[PDB]
């Protein structure tokens, strides 16, 4: 099943069902594009891609044609270059000339194609059309005068964003693109409409006019704050964080990003800890130096020892910081290393890496038939897994089932119940969906980390594990296709479970520590009610919302754009944020602060460089130095035989995530709570 295709005399064997663009991308010649995104559907609208097809007198579009047999696509011919210069002349007939106004200065995809592919002088002397601007939202500023009507935004909002709101009204040059009525197009993934749009017609509103893409310097990092772990280009201008852009890696995020992590860059410059603060004798928090602050931490850490020195991590915390803090508290031998969000510790919490990961690969969500989802809203908690599940729901016949909290997704999802007892009903087998999964080949169940915040979270894990064991009884599946997997809403939770921090706050509520000190924790679960009176808490972190005004000595750490750090997604893949802008003033990196704390105490942590921290990471868990690789891992059968002996009971309440609607999606984990961009998002949504 191969076709001999000539591209200017080449000999490329391409599979059928392809395009002229996907034939020429194996050569390296790029036929110019505006309407065709690679990851959107084919719709020939912009007509820039016209090439000649070896001596047939009509030039054909590179979007629509399959190359049949032995065609020679003359990509650098007279007729194809006249077609490209003519279509660029017709695109720049009615384009209003706002290129010094425009946000896409160097990032215009049509400045570059007019500069390398169009003509020299326009013969237009008539008058351009002008289109009334819209009010789509406080994130997508839409100057629709310069829109080239290429319909790349309406296919994204109809197929992958799934909103059905952007479509074209009218005909001719009077055809204008956008919402016909005054509709606030504000969903998740509404910021990926901007980077899809090759024109600067609709662009970002918080990055309206602040910088320019030739001036900005483009570094690379991984995401935090949703646990999908997407690759991010941070574009920085003069040591200031200016854009966050998605970066292509086809497993984790295929040129998308969510609106939270692409407009929470403005959180990083507002309500940020810079200087170390110390509880004064009056009762306030006064700014001191590191030489006094870490000396007070060491003076209250040499006294309390053994077991009553604890730490709660959670949120935006590196997997290097947990290594340095885990050695820092294991040399004072207290294992009360807790987290913000609760994973159950009754059967194999920190052990056995198939009970808390995405054991199905995120590319392998496309290689599935039944996806059943218990608990969370995937549209809010990690939206890009829901983008992958919409791509798998579109491009092959994938059937969806959802248990608990009937919430409008981007599809129809076949809602079964609001209860955890129907997990036991499917595990025994009386429901119709047992016959539906018996009529299918590849299932996967997923179990988000907001149903595990409930009281019967271990009962939910035991019932879902026995249910998926009966699912593996019903379906003959391969051993390489693991079927039980868990998504998360906190990026540091999977890193703490890989490093062996005991999840939940079970150790804190069992033994109240004499000296807790919290590392970046801002979730509303822990306060001075389960704790003694003095208790000497540090906030070793950034963006003070809860954990810093209720603190004793504040140590300002760095953020996700601000250090060479290791973060793990739900897949088990750990990547490295590289440092883009250093943290302001006296704020340092988290492992740097913890190692200086160990130096100023009587402890001796064996670190002096970040590569030595990665060597200790190789010693403690050797998946977090291995980069851009989900390590293949197993032993779910021993986890199931381990958790079958756990005897727990669910109770009859409807399980529901805290992100029920979109009005509380836009405020999580102290960056979106602290910004004014996401405050404008909540203010726009709730009115």
């Amino acid at each position: 099943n191969l076709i001999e295709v000539f591209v200017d005399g080449q000999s490329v064997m391409v599979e059928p069902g392809t395009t002229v663009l996907q034939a020429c991308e194996k050569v390296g010649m790029q036929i110019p594009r505006f309407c065709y995104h690679e990851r959107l559907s084919v719709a020939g609208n912009c007509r820039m891609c016209l090439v000649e097809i070896e001596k047939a007198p009509k030039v054909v579009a590179a979007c629509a044609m399959p190359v049949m047999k032995g065609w020679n696509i003359l990509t650098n011919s007279e007729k194809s270059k006249k077609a490209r210069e003519g279509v660029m002349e017709f695109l720049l007939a009615n384009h209003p000339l706002d290129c010094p106004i425009c946000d896409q200065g160097g990032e215009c995809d049509l400045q570059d194609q007019s500069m390398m592919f169009g003509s020299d002088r326009s013969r237009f002397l008539e008058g351009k059309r002008a289109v009334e601007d819209k009010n789509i939202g406080p994130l997508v500023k839409t100057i629709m005068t310069r829109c080239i009507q290429c319909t790349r935004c309406i296919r994204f909002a109809s197929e992958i964003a799934g909103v059905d709101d952007l479509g074209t009204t009218g005909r001719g040059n009077d055809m204008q693109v956008g919402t016909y009525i005054e509709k606030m197009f504000m969903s998740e993934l509404s910021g990926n409409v901007i980077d899809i749009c090759p024109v600067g017609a609709l662009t970002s509103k918080p990055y309206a006019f602040t910088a320019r893409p030739w001036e900005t310097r483009k570094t690379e990092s991984i995401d935090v704050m949703d646990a999908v772990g997407s690759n991010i280009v941070v574009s920085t201008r003069t040591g200031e964080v200016m854009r966050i852009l998605p970066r292509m890696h086809e497993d984790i995020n295929e040129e998308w990003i969510s609106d939270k992590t692409r407009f929470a860059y403005d959180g990083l410059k507002r309500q940020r800890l810079t200087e170390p603060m110390v509880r004064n004798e009056k009762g306030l928090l006064t700014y001191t130096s590191w030489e006094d602050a870490l000396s007070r931490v060491a003076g209250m850490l040499q006294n309390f020892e053994g077991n009553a020195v604890a730490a709660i991590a959670g949120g935006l915390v590196d997997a290097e910081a947990l290594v340095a803090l885990k050695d820092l508290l294991n040399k004072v031998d207290s294992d009360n290393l807790c987290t913000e969000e609760i994973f159950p510790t009754e059967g194999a919490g920190t052990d056995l890496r198939s009970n808390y990961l995405l054991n199905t690969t995120i590319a392998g969500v496309e290689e599935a038939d039944v996806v059943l989802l218990v608990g969370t809203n995937p549209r809010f908690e990690a939206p890009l897994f829901n983008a992958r599940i919409r791509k798998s729901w579109l491009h092959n016949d994938l059937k969806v089932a959802l248990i608990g909290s009937p919430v409008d997704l981007t599809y129809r999802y076949d809602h079964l119940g609001d209860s955890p007892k129907i997990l036991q009903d499917i595990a025994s087998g009386r429901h119709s969906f047992c016959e539906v999964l018996k009529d299918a080949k590849k299932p996967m169940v997923v179990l988000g980390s907001s149903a595990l915040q409930r009281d019967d979270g271990a009962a939910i894990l035991v019932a879902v594990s026995n249910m998926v064991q009966k699912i593996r009884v019903t379906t003959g599946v391969a051993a390489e296709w693991k079927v039980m997997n868990i998504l998360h809403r906190i990026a540091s939770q999977v890193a703490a479970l890989d490093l062996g921090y005991k999840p939940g706050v079970e150790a804190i509520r069992k033994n109240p520590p004499k000296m807790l000190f919290l590392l970046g924790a801002d979730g509303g679960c822990i306060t001075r009610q389960d704790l003694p009176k003095d208790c000497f808490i540090v906030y070793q972190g950034h963006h003070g919302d809860v954990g810093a005004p209720m603190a004793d000595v504040i140590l300002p750490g760095a953020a996700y754009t601000e250090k060479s750090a290791t973060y793990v997604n739900t897949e088990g893949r750990a990547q490295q944020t590289k440092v883009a802008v250093t943290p302001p003033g006296l704020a340092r990196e988290d492992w740097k602060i913890i190692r200086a704390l160990s130096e100023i105490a009587g402890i001796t942590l064996p670190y002096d460089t970040l590569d030595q921290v990665r060597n200790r990471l190789e010693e403690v868990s050797p998946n977090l130095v291995r980069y851009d690789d989900i390590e293949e891992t197993n032993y779910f059968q021993q986890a199931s035989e381990l958790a079958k002996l756990v005897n727990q009971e669910v109770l009859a309440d409807p399980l529901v995530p805290p992100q029920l609607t979109i009005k509380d999606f836009y405020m999580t984990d102290s960056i979106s709570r602290a910004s004014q961009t996401m405050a404008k998002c909540v203010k726009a949504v709730t009115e």
Partner: protein
């Protein structure tokens, strides 16, 4: 066509015949012959090739390339031998120009052409100060264009543009002293490479 510069093929065919002649006369000792567009002939030879190829071009009857224009490294870090040392010759009779290339790194030097061309007696000092390319048999090879103690050959691509050493007068020693460099404003480096294919004939294979 008044925009495009007009092309005469007679200089291209006589430079093709002369490059065929130089690759014929030195088969052990010429690697590549490139008669480019804009009608310049480039002859790329061995690091051992430089003394007898330039003696041939200086003293041959049809060559007569007596005057050497410049001796110049370019630093391409993606090669095994990073420095393309070029020698531009000039015929005072035949009105043409050979651009002789040769390859080097910093650890395999070239025999210098001071024994045949005394034009290059300062050009060797210029390229050894500039690129770290040592040359043999020189009278006094010396760093000349950077400072008396400027550690680091500056025109290598691994050298930064800003440098390492700044200078400042100090009243403590009552002399001009060297400091590690820090800048009042940074060098705002741009990304001016457009993402589209500029020239379809000059494309690398994947």
């Amino acid at each position: 066509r008044p925009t495009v510069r007009p092309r005469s093929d007679v200089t291209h065919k006589q430079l093709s015949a002369f490059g065929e002649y130089v690759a014929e006369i030195l088969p052990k000792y010429v690697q590549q012959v490139q008669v480019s567009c804009l009608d310049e002939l480039e002859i790329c030879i061995h690091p051992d090739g430089v003394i007898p190829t330039l003696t041939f071009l200086r003293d041959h009857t049809n060559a007569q390339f007596k005057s050497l224009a410049d001796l110049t490294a370019v630093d391409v870090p993606t090669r095994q031998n990073r420095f393309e040392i070029v020698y531009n010759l000039l015929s005072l009779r035949f009105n043409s120009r050979i651009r002789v290339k040769t390859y080097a790194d910093e650890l395999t030097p070239i025999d210098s052409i001071v024994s045949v061309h005394i034009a290059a007696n300062w050009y060797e000092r210029e390229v050894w100060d500039m690129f770290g390319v040592f040359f043999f048999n020189h009278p006094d090879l010396r760093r000349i264009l950077t400072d008396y103690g400027f550690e680091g050959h500056p025109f290598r691509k691994d050298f930064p543009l800003t440098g390492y050493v700044e200078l400042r007068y100090d009243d403590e020693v009552k002399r001009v002293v060297a400091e590690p460099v820090e800048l009042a404003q940074e060098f705002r480096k741009f990304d001016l490479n457009s993402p589209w294919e500029a020239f379809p004939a000059y494309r690398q294979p994947p």
